[PDB]
Amino acid sequence: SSGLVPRGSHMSISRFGVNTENEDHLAKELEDLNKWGLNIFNVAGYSHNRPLTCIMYAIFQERDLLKTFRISSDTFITYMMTLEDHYHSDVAYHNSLHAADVAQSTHVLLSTPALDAVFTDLEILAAIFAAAIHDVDHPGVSNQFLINTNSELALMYNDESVLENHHLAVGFKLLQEEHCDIFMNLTKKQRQTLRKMVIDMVLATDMSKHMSLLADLKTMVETKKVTSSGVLLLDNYTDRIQVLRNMVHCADLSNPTKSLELYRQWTDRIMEEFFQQGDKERERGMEISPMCDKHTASVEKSQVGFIDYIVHPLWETWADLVQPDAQDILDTLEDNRNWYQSMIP
Numbered sequence: 001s002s003g004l005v006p007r008g009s010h011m012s013i014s015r016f017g018v019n020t021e022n023e024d025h026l027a028k029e030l031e032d033l034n035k036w037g038l039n040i041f042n043v044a045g046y047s048h049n050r051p052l053t054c055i056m057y058a059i060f061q062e063r064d065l066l067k068t069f070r071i072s073s074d075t076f077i078t079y080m081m082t083l084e085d086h087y088h089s090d091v092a093y094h095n096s097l098h099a100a101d102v103a104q105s106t107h108v109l110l111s112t113p114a115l116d117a118v119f120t121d122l123e124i125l126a127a128i129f130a131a132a133i134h135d136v137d138h139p140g141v142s143n144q145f146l147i148n149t150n151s152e153l154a155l156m157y158n159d160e161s162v163l164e165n166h167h168l169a170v171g172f173k174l175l176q177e178e179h180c181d182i183f184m185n186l187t188k189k190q191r192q193t194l195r196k197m198v199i200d201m202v203l204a205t206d207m208s209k210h211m212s213l214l215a216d217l218k219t220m221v222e223t224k225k226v227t228s229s230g231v232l233l234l235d236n237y238t239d240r241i242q243v244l245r246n247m248v249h250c251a252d253l254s255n256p257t258k259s260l261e262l263y264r265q266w267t268d269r270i271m272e273e274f275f276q277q278g279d280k281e282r283e284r285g286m287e288i289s290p291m292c293d294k295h296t297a298s299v300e301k302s303q304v305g306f307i308d309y310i311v312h313p314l315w316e317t318w319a320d321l322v323q324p325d326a327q328d329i330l331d332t333l334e335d336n337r338n339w340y341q342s343m344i345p
């Protein structure tokens with residue numbers, strides 16, 4: 001059988017989009033599965049554009065989660081393909097590629113030396129799952145757009161974290177489609193605890209919560225306890241879920257910390273989507289939102305501002321918490337900032 005599937009499994013790699021011509025190219029790419037340098041774009045190209053299902057399957061075999069929580073390859077692949085299918089392919093940034101990137105990045109962060117032996121397999125399961133569903137069924141417009149157009153969703157959720165709540169509703173609702181219950185064999189107590197942790201992590205991806213989230217994290221860094229070997233000590237549930245909230249938030253905001261080659265592609269996609277919203281706003285006779293105007297946009301300048309006000313402050317604190325594990329991410333982020341700095345017209 002293929003090294004891409006569990007030993008003795010009947011699962012066909014062709015089921016999740018991989019041809020024999022790309023098996024080796026993909027397996028090579030997957031040698032970087034546990035590294036920040038992994039190229040999710042190549043993975044997507046080698047799997048008929050199903051990077052989420054592909055990367056999640058690799059992560060779950062790597063972390064032995066299928067065996068730990070008794071999830072069969074069939075159930076897993078059915079759920080993942082169903083979920084990936086619910087990410088809008090025609091949305092420039094928030095499609096399954098973005099989710100695959102967050103999942104993969106979350107996967108790498110969970111293994112940072114400073115956090116070793118901190119999380120239970122269940123917490124690990126919830127973090128990666130949360131990352132995978134965090135933007136499912138995203139429409140390509142912001143919460144404010146949904147609020148202004150009196151979206152059914154916005155009414156339903158009282159204008160509070162409209163998208164995020166929706167991502168959660170969809171992510172869990174799909175567990176009920178045919179052969180999609182990947183949590184069937186967890187105990188009742190485990191499903192309850194996982195639900196709560198996922199809800200927590202996905203709501204924290206709401207940007208309007210960023211400031212509050214960053215503040216709490218800085219407070220934790222202050223009182224952090226560590227072992228002789230230098231490993232973080234997160235005694236209680238509160239500290240663990242707070243770190244996980246921040247971990248997924250960091251993965252969501254990890255574009256500028258990746259190689260410049262990848263970062264630039266991520267930047268083109270987000271700008272393209274923002275412009276899509278810009279056009280939608282014009283078509284509906286609304287005021288064009290900031291940066292959603294392709295005509296008065298300043299891409300380079302905006303990236304620098306995004307890094308100075310949002311990304312750098314967040315990663316500087318994370319780097320602080322898991323010191324010195326994130327120093328490289330910190331340097332790459334700085335190198336990338338200066339590049340965009342130098343490209344401003």
Ligand SMILES: COc1ccc2c(Nc3c(Cl)cncc3Cl)cc(=O)oc2c1OC1CCCC1
Pocket residue numbers: 205206207252253255256266267270271291302303306
């Ligand atoms: C690579 O460039 C990215 C990538 C992602 C974002 C971004 N992502 C998110 C997140 Cl993390 C959570 N909710 C919504 C968005 Cl759109 C937010 C956000 O405000 O800006 C993002 C961003 O840069 C923006 C494009 C011009 C200035 C800001």
Ligand SMILES: [Mg+2]
Pocket residue numbers: 134135163205206
């Ligand atoms: Mg989101």
Ligand SMILES: [Zn+2]
Pocket residue numbers: 098102134135205252
């Ligand atoms: Zn996201």
